């Protein structure tokens, strides 16, 4: 059995306090506690330390230490406003099974004034209370599938916890209830693996076996009776895995009401891997103002030790954070880019690293712009010239219109002359920028009651600038 420091069965601290739970063993010791990221875990050869600088009511719970090859302490953080630490807001059991509602009391002093309330009063319910575990509804009936709250008498007033929803399932006939952990496994040749196949039933008569590629394994079974149910567990421990261990593992359970099966695939690999891919082309073109999501799929073993998104791109280096992810050997990393501004064009690199090395995938994001037009009057070698500058992506074309009267837009009736410049002089064509084109119109004599409009077009839209001297 491992040894805990402090050597007490229970401990009461105030919110804000520093807590240090040290477990020491002959060999390696393993802690298993309910909250994180609250606790900072330090672990060496002989010991493991659970630590915190700021104790929260959420730190309340039982902390069990085990030596793989048991000891426990209960921590109470007595929050004067929070008497309850709710571990789960959803509890599911079968009918005639005892249901535990994980309402963790933050002050042991409060126990005798504690009551279970049904959001509010229940009907014919048999319950007991544990300061360490919460309320237990004995032999749960179908009618007891409701929303409950835990009351604590603080200063003569009732203080409720957050609702706990109880779902009591009807016990219908059928093959024994199945369990197969893990759902998936990946190991490198030479590593250790554990595959646990278990089955439960309300009746003791049932069979369970673990099959590897349709070949039944000789696993010794550990039969037990827990919470009005009989269980049979098959623990498969592989000391050092090899390509012979890989494949389909089936957990098969049967009784007089049927034969049942559940599966998992065990993959054995020669070395650590890290593969990055995208369903998207790395070259991206979107219109300014549009939203875009850049997604990378990561298949990696062992677990990633680091990952990020970096803006390499030519403009201001505002770095992502933006970045979200879903799924553990498979992960999708999504960089969200809503209502894209022009400084957000450029290169975005996704990097991931694990024991196998590092990998990166770089996206190139080019933005499309409708034309922006500017017209000015200048003199090129003594001659009067109207200069039209049009900016946009893709490259725009230019059109000049001369029309009678002063207007913002020359109309078919007022238009006197039209000049087309489909391919004007390319002034600037840098990557992740607008292309700027220039058209020059030499005007020999410019009259009064007239305006010169320059219109530019590309696939995204049109721009215009009318010049009146």
């Amino acid at each position, epitope marked *: 059995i491992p040894v805990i420091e402090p050597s007490v069965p229970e401990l009461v601290v105030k919110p804000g306090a520093t807590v240090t739970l040290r477990c020491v063993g002959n060999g390696s010791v393993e802690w298993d506690g309910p909250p994180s990221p609250h606790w900072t875990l330090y672990s060496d050869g002989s010991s493991s330390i659970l630590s915190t600088n700021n104790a929260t009511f959420q730190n309340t719970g039982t902390y069990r230490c085990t030596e793989p090859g048991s000891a426990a302490i209960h921590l109470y953080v007595k929050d004067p406003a929070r008497p309850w630490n709710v571990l789960a807001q959803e509890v599911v059991v079968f009918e005639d099974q005892d249901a535990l509602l994980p309402c963790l009391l933050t002050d042991p002093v409060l126990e005798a004034g504690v009551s279970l309330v049904r959001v509010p009063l229940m009907r014919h319910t048999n319950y007991s209370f544990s300061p360490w575990h919460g309320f237990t509804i004995h032999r749960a009936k179908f009618i007891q599938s409701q929303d409950y709250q835990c009351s604590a008498l603080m200063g003569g007033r009732k203080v409720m916890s957050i609702s706990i929803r109880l779902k009591v399932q009807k016990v219908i006939p059928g093959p024994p209830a199945l369990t197969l952990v893990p759902a998936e496994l990946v190991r490198i040749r030479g590593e250790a693996a554990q595959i646990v196949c278990s089955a439960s039933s309300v009746d003791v008569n049932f069979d369970v076996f673990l099959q590897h590629n349709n070949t039944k394994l000789a696993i010794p079974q550990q039969s037990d009776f827990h919470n009005n149910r009989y269980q049979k567990v098959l623990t498969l421990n592989l000391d050092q895995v090899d390509f012979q261990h890989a494949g389909n593992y089936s957990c098969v359970a049967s009784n007089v009401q049927g034969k049942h099966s559940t599966s998992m695939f065990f993959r054995v690999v020669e070395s650590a891997y890290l593969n990055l891919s995208s369903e998207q082309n790395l070259i991206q073109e979107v219109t300014v103002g549009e939203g875009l999501n850049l997604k990378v799929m990561v298949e990696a073993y062992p677990g990633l030790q680091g990952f990020n998104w970096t803006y390499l791109g030519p403009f201001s280096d505002h770095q992502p954070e933006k970045l979200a992810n879903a799924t553990t050997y498979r992960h999708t990393f999504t960089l*969200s880019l809503p209502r894209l501004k022009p400084s957000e064009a450029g290169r975005y690199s996704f990097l991931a690293r694990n024991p196998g090395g590092w990998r990166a995938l770089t996206f190139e994001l080019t933005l499309r712009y409708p034309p922006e037009v500017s017209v000015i009057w200048t003199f090129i070698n003594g001659s009067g010239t109207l200069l039209c500058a049009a900016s946009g992506y893709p490259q725009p074309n230019v059109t000049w219109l001369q029309c009678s009267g002063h207007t913002d837009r020359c109309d078919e009736a007022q238009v006197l002359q039209v000049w087309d410049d489909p391919y004007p002089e390319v002034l600037s064509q840098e990557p992740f920028h607008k292309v700027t084109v220039q058209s020059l119109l030499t005007v020999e004599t410019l009259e009064h009651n007239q305006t010169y409009e320059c219109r530019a077009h590309n696939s995204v839209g049109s721009g215009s600038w009318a010049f009146i001297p």
Partner: antibody, heavy 116, light 107 residues
Framework: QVQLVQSGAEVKKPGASVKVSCKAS????????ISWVRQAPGQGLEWMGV???????NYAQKLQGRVTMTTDTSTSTAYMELRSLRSDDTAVYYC??????????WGQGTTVTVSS | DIQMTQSPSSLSASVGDRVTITCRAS??????VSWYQQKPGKAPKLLIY???NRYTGVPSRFSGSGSGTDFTLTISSLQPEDFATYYC????????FGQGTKLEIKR
């Protein structure tokens, strides 16, 4: 305190242009983008475009080439000009502070009537 | 453009009632959804942004939920001021609004 005050009601003939003003107070005007949203009588809200803090603009595709958004840093005033007016441009025009992911501060609106 | 479909188009409720308004986006808009309240002759007012984030000075009876394409706005206990038009807006791409939900007094 934190407000955008818009110019008064406008009446125009089809083919004319309208230039609506929007003056900021209670905050650093140059620190936030400005969007213009329009609402036709008895209808929903329609985004017209944004002017960013840098001077750049992004117009709604339906108004591209016809709308101009500008700002005056000295007077903390945003402007919106809509040309080649038609009957269906008759709406209430709002300027709003564009925080990209929401419009937190709105102007009181400017009624624009386009009729012959 | 992303279409924002509001449900219902009209709602009758009484002071004290719990009211739910739903909104569906034609494509995934993450949590870039806002809720506005508009009364006749007045400009819209921001209620919720970032799908569930309440704006400053907005009462606790107003709440938002949703991710991806389906969003909800909940008014837990209607007050006489709450009767107005409510619009959902997406800000993932070019801003677009739902057609509105008119909330009126059931009598």
């Amino acid at each position: 305190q934190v407000q955008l005050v818009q110019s008064g009601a406008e009446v125009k003939k089809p083919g004319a242009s309208v230039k609506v003003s929007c003056k900021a107070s209670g905050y650093t005007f140059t620190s936030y983008d400005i969007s213009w949203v329009r609402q036709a009588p008895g209808q929903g809200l329609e985004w017209m475009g944004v002017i960013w803090t840098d001077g750049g603009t992004n117009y709604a595709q339906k108004l591209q080439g016809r709308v101009t958004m500008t700002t005056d840093t000295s007077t903390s005033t945003a402007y919106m000009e809509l040309r080649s007016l038609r009957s269906d441009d008759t709406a209430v025009y709002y300027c709003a502070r564009d925080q990209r992911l929401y419009f937190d501060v709105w102007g009181q609106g400017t009624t624009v009537t386009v009729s012959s | 453009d992303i279409q924002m479909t509001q449900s219902p188009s009209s709602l009758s409720a009484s002071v004290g009632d719990r009211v739910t308004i739903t909104c569906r986006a034609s494509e995934d808009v993450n949590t870039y959804v806002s809720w506005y309240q508009q009364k006749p002759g007045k400009a819209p007012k921001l209620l919720i942004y970032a799908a569930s984030n309440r704006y400053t000075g907005v009462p606790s009876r107003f709440s938002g939920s949703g991710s991806g394409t389906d969003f909800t706005l909940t008014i837990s206990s209607l007050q006489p001021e709450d009767f107005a038009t409510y619009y959902c807006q997406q800000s993932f791409s070019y801003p677009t609004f739902g057609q509105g939900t008119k909330l009126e007094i059931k009598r």
